[PDB]
């Protein structure tokens, strides 16, 4: 960190939902997306380099696998909280993971350098970004599943909104600048696709703390700007990982805070592979030719669905490359 | 760290063999050694700060558990290289541990920390020690069961002295300090127990390349001084771990090195609880009272050994609360 005196400017860089290690439609086609993942992560890193940012926002789901992640995996991710390190102080707030050790890991880490901070706790944190600006973290990660199989949603309900509420009090004794991070799902969210066969946490966007000057989420796939007021962004995640994210918008945001002034942010487009699901009435020949030119022009992944039985079909997928699932 | 200019010293401590999260004999009456083993360690530390060391060198079996170590296991060696690092750099030579992801974790660490050098390779590594002093690091870590289950006793024994010859050859473009690191077993310890359940190294202690300055090992549990030049100490474990090591000598070592002069050292006592076997023909009232008066005495524990059959043994275990084992 510099110690340029204390500015009135913050340049950040937020970004979330790696999911790095994932192997997409394993049970069709098993299509590696490290290298397309890899791709946009380092457009991210090039372009915060470009841009000179002041700190680095990481709101979790970062690798895919909850439990088990690959060694190749968590190579990706610690190569590059390395390379993100090296432009500007960052902050971690992790997603819901699945063993214990990641809290002391992360306390460890945080603890022995200055550029890396985990936030594993609704206890806020105060940082100094690459100018020396001081910045207040609320994080507000996933709970517990302990907590949740209390099964009564009403305190349940009441011990998040009770956590949410000493994070607006802190936020108030901020500094230079307050920050909110949280890893779940805002309520009401429009064309929310559901649960991936796990219990999610449900906030209402209002009762996020109005006081703090930019709220950094993650967890949802897709870009998306909450509110304005205070300022809430999912940067969604840099690939699109299964089918239903077609129309995503992928990749991270630049955040500039002044002081008095309102925020400005800029999307950063991963430029991720497509996504297409061709619907056919009937499998015939008609729509055979139809189904092999469009993969043959088409840069991404392609799914075909269709109703009517064809009989055995043709080996579609055996011949064409980029035809992953026929369901 | 200091920059002294022309400095000729470098006083290291060099402890191993912490076997944290262990619990013994678990099929009698399970004792957990962490208090003592704690104790042991809080004992290292106040002396490496009471003499200012310039280094620390760990030499591997920190945690007993080499699969899935306790989180009580993991915060307890991540508490105690965090006080290290605080007092001097840590040079860090983990023992044969299974999970792959360590050598993830400390390279990752190794980059961020100037404090911290895990060496996981036969690739030497130079430091900076406390007080400017640089120190180039021999390292020769335990290998892999995939190397080793080339079976063919001949080429791997080969590839152990190549290593060897090459550690040799790097050591000799040394700067100001040259430190061999190894987690194995000397060939014909006197006085050596056997495999505890596992393929072991055995390296003869000639083939250590002469020209280093100390040759810090670990992998035994006992201290042992195998040679005068190079100096070659295995510092021993810090508690007894099972019967067996009623006569150990048990701590540290505090080693000063001095260009041109000789090497000097001093053990540091770790002060253990004692171990004690008693051994019966046959359990009679006369060894019944024996066992009784010597068990309330001893601030160790007891293990009772006896093999003709002396009927229903009274609860002498539920009487007396440092008889661990009868066998
Ligand atoms: C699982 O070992 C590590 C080590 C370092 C960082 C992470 C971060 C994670 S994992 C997840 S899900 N979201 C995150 O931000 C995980
Ligand atoms: C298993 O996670 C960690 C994390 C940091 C250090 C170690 C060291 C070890 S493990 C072993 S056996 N000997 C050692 O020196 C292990």
């Given at each position: 960190h510099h110690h340029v005196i204390n500015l009135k400017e913050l340049k950040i860089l937020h970004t979330s939902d790696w999911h790095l290690g994932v192997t997409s439609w394993t049970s069709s086609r098993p299509v590696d997306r490290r290298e397309e993942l890899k791709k946009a992560l380092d457009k991210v890193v090039e372009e915060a380099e470009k841009r000179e940012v002041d700190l680095i926002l990481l709101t979790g789901d970062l690798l895919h696998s909850r439990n088990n992640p690959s060694v190749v995996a968590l190579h990706d991710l610690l190569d590059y909280l390395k390379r993100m390190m090296r432009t500007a102080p960052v902050v971690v707030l992790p997603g819901n993971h699945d063993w214990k050790g990641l809290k002391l890991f992360g306390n460890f880490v945080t603890s022995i350098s200055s550029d890396i901070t985990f936030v594993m706790s609704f206890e806020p944190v105060d940082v100094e970004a690459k100018r020396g600006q001081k910045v207040r973290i609320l994080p507000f990660p996933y709970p517990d599943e302990s907590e949740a199989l209390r099964k009564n949603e009403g305190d349940f309900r009441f011990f998040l909104e009770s956590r949410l509420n000493k994070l607006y009090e802190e936020a108030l004794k901020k500094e230079d600048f307050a920050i909110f991070m949280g890893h779940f799902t805002v309520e009401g969210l429009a064309g929310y696709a559901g649960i991936e066969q796990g219990?999610?946490?449900?906030?209402?966007?209002?009762?996020?703390?109005?006081?703090?000057?930019?709220?950094?989420?993650?967890?949802?796939?897709?870009?998306?700007?909450?509110?304005?007021?205070?300022?809430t962004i999912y940067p969604g995640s840099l690939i699109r990982i299964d089918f239903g994210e077609e129309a995503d918008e992928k990749g991270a945001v630049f955040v500039e805070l002044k002081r008095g002034e309102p925020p400005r942010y800029e999307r950063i487009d991963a430029s991720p592979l497509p996504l297409k699901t061709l619907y056919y009435k009937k499998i015939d020949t008609s729509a055979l030719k139809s189904i092999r030119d469009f993969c043959r022009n088409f840069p991404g992944y392609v799914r075909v669905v269709y109703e009517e039985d064809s009989g055995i079909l043709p080996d579609l997928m055996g011949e064409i490359d980029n035809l992953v699932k026929i369901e």
């Open positions: 219990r999610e946490i449900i906030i209402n966007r209002a009762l996020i703390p109005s006081v703090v000057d930019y709220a950094a989420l993650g967890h949802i796939h897709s870009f998306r700007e909450i509110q304005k007021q205070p300022l």
